[PDB]
Curated annotation (Swiss-Prot), chain A:
UniProt source species: Saccharomyces cerevisiae (strain ATCC 204508 / S288c)
Organism lineage string: Eukaryota, Fungi, Dikarya, Ascomycota, Saccharomycotina
Localization terms from the record: Cytoplasm; Nucleus
Signal peptide range: none
The protein's name: 26S proteasome regulatory subunit 6B homolog
Coiled coil: none
Entry's family note: Belongs to the AAA ATPase family.
This protein's encoding gene: RPT3
Curated annotation (Swiss-Prot), chain B:
Gene name of this polypeptide: RPT2
Residues that span the membrane, as ranges: none
Organism: Saccharomyces cerevisiae (strain ATCC 204508 / S288c) (Baker's yeast)
Protein's UniProt name: 26S proteasome regulatory subunit 4 homolog
Lineage: Eukaryota, Fungi, Dikarya, Ascomycota, Saccharomycotina
Function per UniProt: The 26S proteasome is involved in the ATP-dependent degradation of ubiquitinated proteins. The regulatory (or ATPase) complex confers ATP dependency and substrate specificity to the 26S complex. Has ATPase activity.
Protein location: Cytoplasm; Nucleus
Family affiliation: Belongs to the AAA ATPase family.
Curated annotation (Swiss-Prot), chain C:
Function of the protein: The 26S proteasome is involved in the ATP-dependent degradation of ubiquitinated proteins. The regulatory (or ATPase) complex confers ATP dependency and substrate specificity to the 26S complex.
Gene this chain is encoded by: RPT1
Modification sites for Phosphoserine: 69
Note from the entry: Present with 105 molecules/cell in log phase SD medium.
Family: Belongs to the AAA ATPase family.
Protein name: 26S proteasome regulatory subunit 7 homolog
Lineage: Eukaryota, Fungi, Dikarya, Ascomycota, Saccharomycotina
Range of the intact protein held here: 96 to 201 of 467
Swiss-Prot record, chain D:
Function: The 26S proteasome is involved in the ATP-dependent degradation of ubiquitinated proteins. The regulatory (or ATPase) complex confers ATP dependency and substrate specificity to the 26S complex.
Full protein segment contained here: 340 to 436 of 437
UniProt organism field: Saccharomyces cerevisiae (strain ATCC 204508 / S288c)
Keyword tags: Acetylation, ATP-binding, Nucleotide-binding, Proteasome
Coiled-coil ranges (or none): none
GO BP, sorted A to Z: ERAD pathway; nucleotide-excision repair; positive regulation of RNA polymerase II transcription preinitiation complex assembly; positive regulation of transcription elongation by RNA polymerase II; proteasome regulatory particle assembly; proteasome-mediated ubiquitin-dependent protein catabolic process
Keyword Amino-acid biosynthesis among UniProt keywords: no
Taxonomic classification: Eukaryota, Fungi, Dikarya, Ascomycota, Saccharomycotina
Any one GO molecular-function label of the UniProt entry: protein domain specific binding
Protein name: 26S proteasome subunit RPT4
Family: Belongs to the AAA ATPase family.
GO cellular component: nucleus; proteasome complex; proteasome regulatory particle, base subcomplex
Record flagged with keyword Lipid biosynthesis: no
Source species, domain of life: Eukaryota
C-alpha cells in the first residue's frame, strides 16, 4: 500500500468469469431420485 | 529535465497563456524563455515545466504514435520490367 | 500556476454568515463574516465567499485575492485559484471557446 | 418448473361484475345521489376496473364545469358515453406470457 | 457524497447537528479531514434560473389556426382544474397526473 | 544471507516503477515517452542508457 510491490498472490477471482455452480448450492437431485432409465444410466456413470 | 506536455488553448495578451494538461485540470502559465509567442499560436503543443508550469517552448510539434504508422520507411522493389504487361494500365497511372 | 476555475454561483458570507459568533445567518456589519455588531469584540475581513467549480470538477468555497473586486467576480466569470490551497488571487479572461472557434472561422 | 407452476388467468369483470366496481368508486368521491347504475353498466360494456375509476373522474370533470362539488346522475350518464369510445380505440383484450 | 468523488461517513461535529440537515443539501465539508464543517444553502445554477419564466413570446389560441379536438382537450386536462382547484380537493377525484402530447412534428 | 534479504526489502521500499514507450527521439538527447495510463512526459534519458 505505501509503495507498490508484489508480495503475495491471491486465488483467481477475475479474467476467467464465473459460470460455476458449487457443491454448496448443488442440485438436490441424485441417482436415487432417478426411477427409470436404468440401462442407459450405467453408460453415463462409466462415461463421466 | 522532467517535463509534462500541454496543449496551447489560447494566448493571453501580457506574455501569458492558458494551457490544457493531459490530466483533468487546466493551468494558467506564463510565456517565458527563448521560444517567442509568434512561434506559438493556439492549436500547438507546448511543453510545461514541472515545479511551476511554465511555457518552455514546443518540441513535440503535434506528434502522435499514429504518425509513426502512417510514415513508411520500407522501400519496395519495384519498377516496370518487374511488371509483366498491361502496357496501357502502366501508362495511365504514370501519367496521373 | 493558478489552477483554473469559474464561478458557478456567488453566495455571500456578509449576509448569510459562515461562522458562529452570535448568529448563524445574516451579518449586519456586512464587511465581516459573522458579526452584526462591533461590540462582539471581533471583526473579520469578508467581501463575498464565491463558490467555484475547478477543471478538476471538485468544488470549493475559496478565499479572497490581493486586488480582486466583488464587482468583477460574479457568475459566469473564469477566475484562477491555488492548486492546493484554494484561494483566488488573480482573475482570468472571459470565455473558453476561442480554442475551437478560431480554426472553424476562415 | 418449480418457480411458476400454476397459471391463474384474470379476465374482465362481467356484466354484473362491472356493477360492483361503480359502487366502490361513487362512495370514495362525493355525490348527491346517483342510482342510474343499472343503465350505466350497459354503456360501460367491456371496461376494465381502471377505466371505471377514470369514468368517475370524467363525471367529476363535467360537474365542476356546472359549478357543483357533487357528482350529478346526469354527469355519470355523460361520463360513460365519453370513456367508451376512447376505451375501444386504445383497447386491450390481451394475455401476457 | 463529496465533490472529491468519495462517499464519507464521518463522526458528526458539535456545531452542525443532524437537525440542521435534510437529504440533498449542499454542505461545506473541511478540505483536509472530512467532517461536516458548515452549512450552505441549496445549489442554484444560471441555466436553471433562466429556465423559469419564458412565457412571452405568447402564442394564445387566436393565432393558432384550428387544432380542435385537441385545444379543448388541453383545457380539460390543465386549465380547468388549475383555476377551480379548491372544488377538486373537496370532491375527492384525482387531477390528471400530467399529460403526454405526441405525434409528427 | 543477511545481504540478500536486505537487498530485497529495499526494492519494496523504493516508491514504484512505471511503464511507457519511446515515441520519438529529439535532438537535445531527450526522448518523448508515452506513460501508458497517464500522459506523455518528455525527459532527459538515464545516465547508463543512450
Amino acid at each position: 500500500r505505501h509503495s507498490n510491490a508484489l508480495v503475495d498472490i491471491l486465488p483467481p477471482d477475475s479474467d476467467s468469469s464465473i459460470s460455476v455452480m458449487g457443491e454448496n448450492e448443488k442440485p438436490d437431485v441424485t441417482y436415487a431420485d432417478v426411477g427409470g432409465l436404468d440401462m442407459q444410466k450405467q453408460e453415463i456413470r462409466e462415461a463421466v | 529535465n522532467p517535463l509534462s506536455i500541454g496543449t496551447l488553448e489560447e494566448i493571453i495578451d501580457d506574455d501569458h497563456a492558458i494551457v490544457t494538461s493531459p490530466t483533468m485540470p487546466d493551468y494558467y502559465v506564463s510565456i517565458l524563455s527563448f521560444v517567442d509567442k509568434e512561434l506559438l499560436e493556439p492549436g500547438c503543443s507546448v511543453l510545461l515545466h514541472h515545479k511551476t508550469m511554465s511555457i518552455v517552448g514546443v518540441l513535440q510539434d503535434d506528434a502522435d504514435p499514429m504518425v509513426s504508422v502512417m510514415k513508411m520507411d520500407k522501400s519496395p522493389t519495384e519498377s516496370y520490367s518487374d511488371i509483366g504487361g498491361l502496357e496501357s494500365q502502366i501508362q495511365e497511372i504514370k501519367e496521373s | 500556476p493558478l489552477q483554473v476555475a469559474r464561478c458557478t454561483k456567488i453566495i455571500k458570507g456578509n449576509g448569510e454568515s459562515d461562522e458562529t459568533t452570535t448568529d448563524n445567518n445574516n451579518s449586519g456589519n456586512s464587511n465581516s463574516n459573522s458579526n452584526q455588531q462591533s461590540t462582539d469584540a471581533d471583526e473579520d475581513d469578508e467581501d463575498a465567499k464565491y463558490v467555484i467549480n475547478l477543471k478538476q470538477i471538485a468544488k470549493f468555497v475559496v478565499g479572497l485575492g490581493e486586488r480582486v473586486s466583488p464587482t468583477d467576480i460574479e457568475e459566469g466569470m473564469r477566475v484562477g485559484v491555488d492548486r492546493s490551497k484554494y484561494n483566488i488571487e488573480l482573475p482570468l479572461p472571459p470565455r473558453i471557446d476561442p480554442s475551437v472557434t478560431m480554426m472553424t472561422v476562415e | 418448473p418449480g418457480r411458476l407452476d400454476r397459471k391463474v388467468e384474470i379476465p374482465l369483470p362481467n356484466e354484473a361484475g362491472r356493477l360492483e366496481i361503480f359502487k366502490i368508486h361513487t362512495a370514495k368521491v362525493k355525490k348527491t345521489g346517483e342510482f342510474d347504475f343499472e343503465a350505466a353498466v350497459k354503456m360501460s360494456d367491456g371496461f376494465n376496473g381502471a377505466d371505471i375509476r377514470n369514468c368517475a373522474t370524467e363525471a367529476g370533470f363535467f360537474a365542476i364545469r356546472d359549478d357543483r362539488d357533487h357528482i350529478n346522475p346526469d354527469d355519470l350518464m355523460k361520463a360513460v358515453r365519453k370513456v367508451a369510445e376512447v376505451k375501444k380505440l386504445e383497447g386491450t383484450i390481451e394475455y401476457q406470457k | 457524497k463529496t465533490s472529491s468523488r468519495q462517499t464519507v461517513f464521518l463522526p458528526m461535529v458539535g456545531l452542525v447537528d443532524p437537525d440542521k440537515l435534510k437529504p440533498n443539501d449542499l454542505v461545506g465539508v473541511n478540505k483536509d479531514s472530512y467532517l461536516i464543517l458548515d452549512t450552505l444553502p441549496s445549489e442554484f445554477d444560471s441555466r436553471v434560473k433562466a429556465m423559469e419564466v419564458d412565457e412571452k413570446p405568447t402564442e394564445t389560441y387566436s393565432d393558432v389556426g384550428g387544432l380542435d379536438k385537441q385545444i379543448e382537450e388541453l383545457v380539460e386536462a390543465i386549465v380547468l382544474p388549475m383555476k377551480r382547484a379548491d372544488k377538486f380537493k373537496d370532491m375527492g377525484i384525482r387531477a390528471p397526473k400530467g399529460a403526454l402530447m405526441y405525434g409528427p412534428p | 544471507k543477511v545481504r540478500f534479504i536486505k537487498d530485497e526489502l529495499r526494492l519494496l521500499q523504493e516508491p514504484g516503477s512505471y511503464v511507457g514507450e519511446v515515441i520519438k527521439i529529439v535532438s537535445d538527447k531527450k526522448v518523448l515517452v508515452k506513460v501508458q495510463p497517464e500522459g506523455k512526459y518528455i525527459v532527459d534519458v538515464a545516465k547508463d542508457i543512450n
